[PDB]
A paper describes a structure:
Bacteriophage [name] infects Pseudomonas aeruginosa and is part of an experimental phage cocktail developed to eradicate P. aeruginosa infections in Galleria mellonella (wax moth) larvae and vertebrate models. [name] is a PB1-like Myoviridae of the Pbunavirus genus characterized by a ~66.2 kbp genome, significantly smaller than the classical enterobacteria phage T4 (~169 kbp). Here, we describe the structure of the whole [name] virion before and after DNA ejection at 3.1 Å and 4.5 Å resolution, respectively, determined using cryogenic electron microscopy (cryo-EM). We identify and build de novo structures for 19 unique [name] gene products, resolve the tail genome-ejection machine in both extended and contracted states, and decipher the complete architecture of the baseplate formed by 66 polypeptide chains.
Numbering used by the authors:
A (entry chain h), B (entry chain N): 1 to 152
C (entry chain F): 1 to 504
D (entry chain W), E (entry chain M): 2 to 109
Amino acid sequence: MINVSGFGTGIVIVSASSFPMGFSLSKFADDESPISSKELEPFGYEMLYDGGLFAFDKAAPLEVSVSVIAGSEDDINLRILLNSKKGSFRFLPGIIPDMTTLVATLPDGGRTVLSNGTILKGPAIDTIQNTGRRKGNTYTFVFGSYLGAQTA
Amino acid sequence: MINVSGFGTGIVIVSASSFPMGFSLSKFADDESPISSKELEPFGYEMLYDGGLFAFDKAAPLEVSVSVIAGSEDDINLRILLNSKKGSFRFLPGIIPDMTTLVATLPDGGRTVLSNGTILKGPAIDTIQNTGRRKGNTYTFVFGSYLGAQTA
Amino acid sequence: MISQSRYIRIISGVGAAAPVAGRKLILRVMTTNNVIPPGIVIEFDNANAVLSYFGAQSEEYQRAAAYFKFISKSVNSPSSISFARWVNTAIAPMVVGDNLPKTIADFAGFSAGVLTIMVGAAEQNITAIDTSAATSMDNVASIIQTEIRKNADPQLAQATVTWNQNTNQFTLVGATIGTGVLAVAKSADPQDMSTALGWSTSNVVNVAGQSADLPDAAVAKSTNVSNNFGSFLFAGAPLDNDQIKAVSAWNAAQNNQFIYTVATSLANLGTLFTLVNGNAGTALNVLSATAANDFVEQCPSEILAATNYDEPGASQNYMYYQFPGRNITVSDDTVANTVDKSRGNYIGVTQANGQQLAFYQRGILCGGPTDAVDMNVYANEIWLKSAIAQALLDLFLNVNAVPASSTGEAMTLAVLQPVLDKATANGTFTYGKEISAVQQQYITQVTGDRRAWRQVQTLGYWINITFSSYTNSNTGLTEWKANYTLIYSKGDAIRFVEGSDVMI
Amino acid sequence: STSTIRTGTNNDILLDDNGNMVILRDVEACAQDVRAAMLMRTGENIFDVNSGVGYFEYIFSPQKSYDDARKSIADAILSSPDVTGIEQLDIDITGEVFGVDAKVITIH
Amino acid sequence: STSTIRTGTNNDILLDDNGNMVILRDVEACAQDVRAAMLMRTGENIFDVNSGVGYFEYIFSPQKSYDDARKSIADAILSSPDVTGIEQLDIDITGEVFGVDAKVITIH
């Protein structure tokens, strides 16, 4: 028996300037996927004219998507994060403005940290379905470096 | 009466450097296809100015997809393989550094071996679906040697 | 003012340096020289070392000098050689224990109370020996010999001593022949010779008196000491037919492990071939009666030792290699046909009156119908067996357990994969050859699976592993064993060329 | 346009019954010449080194590609006074023998 | 095309038993010369500054890339009279030792 349930997970987001101390996400939407990501492609390959195979190394980013219930506190926090403009304030050399760090805790105890990245797209105003309710707002991040710690 | 069941299939992966001894996979995901591949295309053709036909050889790779239950030990092992960096591992070049060999067994006794290849792409963090489950991770390999083992 | 070697160190070294680890295919020479102890094998890396150890007048120096100076098509050299002793007749017990240049005549001031302890059949001690003079090491050797003769023990009543100079050892010799054991021990006396002398200190070679033995027993014991060689040889006087037949049979007892090379004359081939039909692994070479021997029998050994197996394109032919030093034996078609029918090897001359061409012609090797005949196939099988065995032992020593299930056989395939890749890149396997109907039937008979001949035609090999149960002879219990079968297409080399041209 | 002296299956002058050396005209002279050229080996022609077939370096010795032997034989077939071009070359290398087959083109 | 005087494991003139200095011919002279050049270090050669190996600037001192050390060593191996090109260079850096390995190519 393997328990793959996602209930009880939590997210903490820390921003360099806008949110120096960080906040927490707890209200995850229902109709859309709570946490989603794209595939990682750090390797590539090329063919030689004799029929052989050659494999090299490629640079690849990491994209993450989260969704929350409209009207909750987490939604407006993420809206502030999105509306923050990188033109203002300053930065240490080679650091990127607003280096946002994300820490995700799995219910069993394992967790992961992601750094060197920022939010890049989200909704601005609420959407209304024909059924008469509001869509779950979804936001997309990107990250350059990550880690793995799956023991607890 | 021909038995085409896939129960009891085992797969062993051995790596040149990261896993010199190798490990085995036994926990295959449920919703995704446990193992699949694209069609080999090793021949080509072109139409002649007269109206005839001409055929010729062509270079062609092989791609394999493997899916496992999230959170299992096998997921951790393939995550290690994916995270291994090709640029490191100072070693004799031109032999596809960190070559990986895969051996798969069928319930009847059929055995197939594939060499000259490496892992290509896969997920980085777990995914949550609207039902509350964790999606089965999928990984993609590539191989160059089509070693024709189909023993009975 | 402190030294370079504490911070920076460069070893340099001339080119063509190839570090190697694994089985070595090098010549082993069984000699009747007195200097070599019966139970020890010695390895040299240069002709100069052999010269220093043995001396110019020795036959062994000439053999080594001829052996080392050789270049293959790809520039390579044997880079090693080994020696071993065969006792022809009964010998007295003896001891020897020095290798390092300890002898600089330090016997001065050591005269008082010499109490070296000789542990023979019965414990006995020596009396005071005068060494304060220290005039010459042979003189003090004679002094020690006389003092030993002063004892009444039957072995020490006629003992002798000897000191060699180019090498630095001190040797004792027993009186009787074929029986007896000697030993030497140190004592608490501060000024004792045994500590200063070679024997009774750390690595010391001891010898037990014992009767004469057949050559096959000697080579068997030598292998039991160590087996890191290939293509052994007997030096010195030629052996009679019966001894050669016995050695050939013993070599055939082992399955493709070494090559037995011998020298013989034209008149003698009629006898040997009838005696040594079959018995694979034996090479016959023709020797010239008129001229000097020139050591013709070493040629296959040099060719084999020069071979490098890790790099691609390794398999080489034996038909066309030129030895300028050697002489010429045959020059006619009739004698060549007779020798070929007798399965002999030689250096045949194609011409005079201009630059000469001669080469070690036949790469054939006597053996039964089933076993491989060509030399290159034999060498490739030797290397393949060594590699397979090493891989299997590595598997057993590394994994904690090998279950008797499909996982275990998968592990075995995974381990054997790199060896087969190295072999197919090397050249011992071949692809694309045509398969005759009788050959296809033979393949299907050997392995119960049909359509394996297609596999060996395309890739060049076919493998399968299964496991079963059995009971061993030593203990009534039962264990589990794994069985595999390997079929591959033999390598080949060009011997004869066919041509034709048409004007239109 | 060429001519030579007839030789037998061995490379010696062959005389007819009358005891007269015969001067072969074209075509047949070309066949004799190409046979001799392919049989002549490298390193033998004094006053012209680097001409002939490099048997011992390119065929008998263990080799990587075997294209070099084909080039050498193709050159040897050429350089004949009358030969124009080569139509076929096979290099069977089947079994134990090293098969070779060719068909050339002359002006006549 | 080069020559020099033989020296021992320490960099002093070594004499044979006969008491005669030996002038090494090519190949071996190349090995001796390349060892000496790699052992020289920069900064002390009067009449030619900026030649040698920058040990104290590029290896022993804390560094960022370590490419500069490779460039300097490659240059030092070159400038020998006979050396043509470098086949391999490793630069291991394992533990405390700074491994260096090279294979050089000469005309002869």
